[PDB]
Every structure is written in structure tokens, then in C-alpha cells.
């Protein structure tokens, strides 16, 4: 059986590939995988890049060439190490750069009939959809999470956005939870191929957990009161299933945020006698700058919307209602 090989720059169990090697959609093939992982791991290190600064994909003979190169390189690293010079930091956070890398390569190791995400019931709350790595970059970048944090993705699919948010922050715990069987149980090959991956790199995550369960069960209100950044693909939900969520989100602590495609109250929202138990009452909403072209299939560009629970609103009606 031919096979390439490709070692760790920490000494992890090598990645091996069966030739032929696989193609995962029109975009995407093993072949460059590889090549991209060489390129990846000689950004982490330095001296690698450096010993490696004629590749036909089609070509066995040529592929192997390139693995030999890079597996011979880190073999000459790993003895500068047990020399003067200073292993790798170890336990480091991935750069951006590195986790949409390693994101694709377990994503397409993982996700091995993408069709099958497909076959969801049309016009259903079922309806899946992924949000794009870089607003997942964009929401990491503008909610700040600390460690005092705990992050739900609810409805969370195959588990990419924990997947991101846990390599990308120090928030206590991550979870996300997936109702449907196909998506769930890709969620568990995902979760299985992302730890191995990252210890491949030598890179950390934060703790997190994926889950199969139904958000709206008796269990969940109160992981929901709990959360303190939820994240929600809601724009296929529906009215009923949003409403649900409206009276969990309720519960939620001062501070407490919500980013979602679709917002929960509205944007202009006055407080008056009219409208008093509306969900509006205690949050302030506004829409997450788009990212520069970047369009949706509407046409206009692609929107999302952060709330943070603030009973300062209320509190302020209700002084207001004694104060001419
Ligand atoms: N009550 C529920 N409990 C659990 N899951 C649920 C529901 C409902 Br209603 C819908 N869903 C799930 O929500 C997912 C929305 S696509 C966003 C994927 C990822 N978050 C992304 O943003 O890329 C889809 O897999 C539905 O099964």
C-alpha cells in the first residue's frame, strides 16, 4: 500500500495519507492539504521555513519528494533542540491564519459526504447553514471574551464555530448543542479530528464540549440563564422557535450577549406603556458592521446583531413614569 507521511513538528504520531489521494470537493484535495500543512508548520517554525526556502500533485514519485524534504527538515529541527536552541513555544494559541487551515483540513476529514447536510426538511427550523469562518473571526474580534465567560453555540451543526471560538479564546468552557442526527454525528468526527490536528501543530484550545440535545428542553433553560455569550444561527428558526428563545434569553444576567442572524427585538426599539413585557425591554441590539464585499444571497451584504441584556432600559422607563 503506497502512502505519504507527514511527521509533527512536536513529535506527535504522523499524519499519513493513502495514495491515490482524495479528493474532498472541487476545490479541495488531499494534495494540496499537504502542501498547505508544509507551508503552515514552516510558518510555526522558522529554521524549517528556512530549510525549505517541481511539484506535480499527480505525480507519486514527486509527492513523496516533498514529504521526504519536510520530514527530513524536522528531523534536523528536532536535533536543534536538543542543542542550545529553544523548542517551539508549546501551548500557544493557532494564528488566524493557521486555524482556517486547520479548521478546512478537519472539516473535509471529518465531513466525508457533504451532500448529507443537505437533506434537512426545506422551510423547516431544521434548515441548515454554516456561518463563514471570517465572521466567526469578526464576532471574536468585537465580543472579547475573558475567562469568566462560558460560550454556546445553540444549534451548533458539525461544531466549526466552537471549534474556532475555543482555539481562538480563553472562555471558561464551550459548548454546542445540535438536534439533528446527521449533523451531530458528523459534530463527533469533527471533535475527534480537531483534537488530534491541534496536538499535531502543538497548538491549545479552551475546554469545550459538543453536544447532541434539543436547546429548548427543560435542561437547557437554565444552561441558557447561565451562558454568558450565546451564539445563534437563527435566520431559518422561525417566529415560534425565536419567541422560545425570547422568553430563555430573558433569564440571562446583566451583561449577558447574544450575536445571531436574525434580531430578537428590534433595532429602533422605544420603550412604552404598549410593549412593556417585549423582550426589547432589557436589551440593547445593534448590527455588527458588515465585512467589505461580502454578500448574501439577498444581495445586500451579510448581517449580524449583537445583544447584551441591560435592565437599565427598564429601570429608566420606570423612574421616568414618576418624573415629568
Ligand atoms: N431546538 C434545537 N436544538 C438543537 N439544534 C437545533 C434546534 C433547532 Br429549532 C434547530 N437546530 C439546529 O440549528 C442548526 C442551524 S444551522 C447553523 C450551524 C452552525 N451553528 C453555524 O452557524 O455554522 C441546524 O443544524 C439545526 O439542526
Not at 430563555?248 to 420603550?271: D, H, Q, T, W, Y
Not at 436589551?283 to 448581517?303: A, Q, Y
Request: net charge negative.
Amino acid at each position: 500500500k503506497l502512502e505519504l507521511r507527514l511527521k509533527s513538528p512536536v513529535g506527535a504520531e504522523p499524519a499519513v495519507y493513502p495514495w491515490p489521494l482524495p479528493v474532498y470537493d472541487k476545490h479541495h484535495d488531499a494534495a494540496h492539504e499537504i502542501i498547505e500543512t508544509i507551508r503552515w508548520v514552516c510558518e510555526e517554525i522558522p529554521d524549517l521555513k528556512l530549510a525549505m526556502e517541481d511539484y506535480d500533485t499527480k505525480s507519486f514519485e514527486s509527492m513523496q519528494r516533498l514529504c521526504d524534504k519536510y520530514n527530513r527538515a524536522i528531523d534536523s529541527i528536532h536535533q536543534l533542540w536538543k542543542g542550545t536552541t529553544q523548542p517551539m513555544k508549546l501551548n500557544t494559541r493557532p494564528s488566524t491564519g493557521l486555524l482556517r487551515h486547520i479548521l478546512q483540513q478537519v472539516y473535509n476529514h471529518s465531513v466525508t459526504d457533504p451532500e448529507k447536510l443537505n437533506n434537512y426538511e426545506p422551510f423547516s427550523p431544521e434548515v441548515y447553514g454554516e456561518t463563514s469562518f471570517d465572521l466567526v473571526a469578526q464576532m471574536i474580534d468585537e465580543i472579547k471574551m475573558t475567562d469568566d465567560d462560558l460560550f454556546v453555540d445553540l444549534g451548533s451543526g458539525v461544531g466549526q464555530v466552537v471549534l474556532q471560538v475555543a482555539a481562538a479564546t480563553n472562555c471558561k468552557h464551550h459548548y454546542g448543542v445540535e438536534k439533528a442526527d446527521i449533523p451531530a454525528k458528523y459534530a463527533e468526527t469533527m471533535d475527534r479530528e480537531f483534537r488530534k490536528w491541534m496536538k499535531w501543530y502543538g497548538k491549545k484550545h479552551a475546554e469545550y464540549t459538543l453536544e447532541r440535545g434539543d436547546f429548548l428542553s427543560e435542561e437547557w433553560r437554565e444552561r441558557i440563564a447561565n451562558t454568558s455569550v450565546i451564539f445563534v444561527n437563527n435566520f431559518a428558526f422561525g417566529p415560534e422557535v425565536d419567541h422560545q428563545l425570547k422568553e430563555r434569553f430573558a433569564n440571562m444576567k446583566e451583561g449577558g450577549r447574544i450575536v445571531s442572524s436574525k434580531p430578537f427585538a428590534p433595532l429602533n426599539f422605544r420603550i412604552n406603556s404598549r410593549n412593556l413585557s417585549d423582550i426589547g425591554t432589557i436589551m440593547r441590539v445593534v448590527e455588527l458592521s458588515p465585512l467589505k464585499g461580502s454578500v448574501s444571497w439577498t444581495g445586500k451584504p451579510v448581517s449580524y446583531y449583537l445583544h447584551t441584556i441591560d435592565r437599565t432600559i427598564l429601570e429608566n422607563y420606570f423612574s421616568s413614569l414618576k418624573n415629568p
